[PDB]
Amino acid sequence: MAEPWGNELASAAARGDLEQLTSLLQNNVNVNAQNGFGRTALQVMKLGNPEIARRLLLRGANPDLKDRTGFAVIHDAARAGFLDTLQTLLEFQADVNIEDNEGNLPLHLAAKEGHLRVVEFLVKHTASNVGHRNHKGDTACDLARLYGRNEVVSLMQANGAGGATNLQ
C-alpha cells in the first residue's frame, strides 16, 4: 500500500487499535507523517492506551507533534487525562515543556481540567513546568489556579512549581 500513517495510522491509532498499529508499523509507516489535519497517529493515538503512541514512539513518535492549536500529543495525553499516555511521551523524552499555539502546555491543561494526579506526574518526573509561564505567563500554576483547581495548583505551588520563588 502507498499510505504511510495518516488515515491508517490516525485511524487504528486514534481508534484504540493497538495491534493494527504494530502490523502497519512492521510493514511501513511515516514515523512522522501528518495528514492535512497536521496530526499523526502519534498525536491522535487513542490516549486510552498509552502504548498506542509507544508503538509509534519506538520507531520515532515526537511527542511534541503539535497540531493546529499548537497542541502537542502531550496535551492530549494530559489535557484529557491519559498520564500513562503522558508517560509514553515522557518515556520517549517528550517536551514536558511542550505547549500550545500560544504558551500554555500539557501541564496547564491537566491543570485546567483538574487532572491532579496527572499534573502531579509532570511535577514528579520530566522537567516539570514550574515557572513554565504560558504566553502571558499563566504558567501551569496560573492555569489550574484560575480554573479553581487548587489541588492541581498546590500540586505545583507546593512542588516549588507555582511561582513562590522564596529561598532565603
Swiss-Prot record:
Tell me where the transmembrane regions lie. Answer: none
**Mutagenesis or variant effect for A72P:** In breast cancer; loss of CDK6 interaction
Task: Name the GO cellular-component terms.
Answer: cytoplasm; cytosol; nucleus
Q: Which Pfam families match?
A: Ank_2, Ank_4
The entry's note on the tissues where this protein occurs is:
Highest levels found in skeletal muscle. Also found in pancreas and heart.
Which BP terms from GO are recorded?
negative regulation of cell growth; negative regulation of cell population proliferation; negative regulation of stem cell proliferation; oligodendrocyte differentiation; regulation of G1/S transition of mitotic cell cycle; stem cell proliferation
Start-end of each ANK repeat: 4-33, 37-65, 69-98, 102-132
For this UniProt entry, which residues form the secretion signal?
Answer: none
Q: Which UniProt keywords apply?
A: ANK repeat, Cell cycle, Repeat
**Keyword Lipid metabolism found:** no
Q: Which InterPro entries match?
A: Ank_Repeat/CDKN_Inhibitor, Ankyrin_rpt, Ankyrin_rpt-contain_sf
Summarize subunit and interaction data from the UniProt record for this chain: Heterodimer of p18 with CDK6.
Entry's family note = Belongs to the CDKN2 cyclin-dependent kinase inhibitor family.
| Name used for this protein in its record | Cyclin-dependent kinase 4 inhibitor C
Species name for this entry? Homo sapiens (Human)
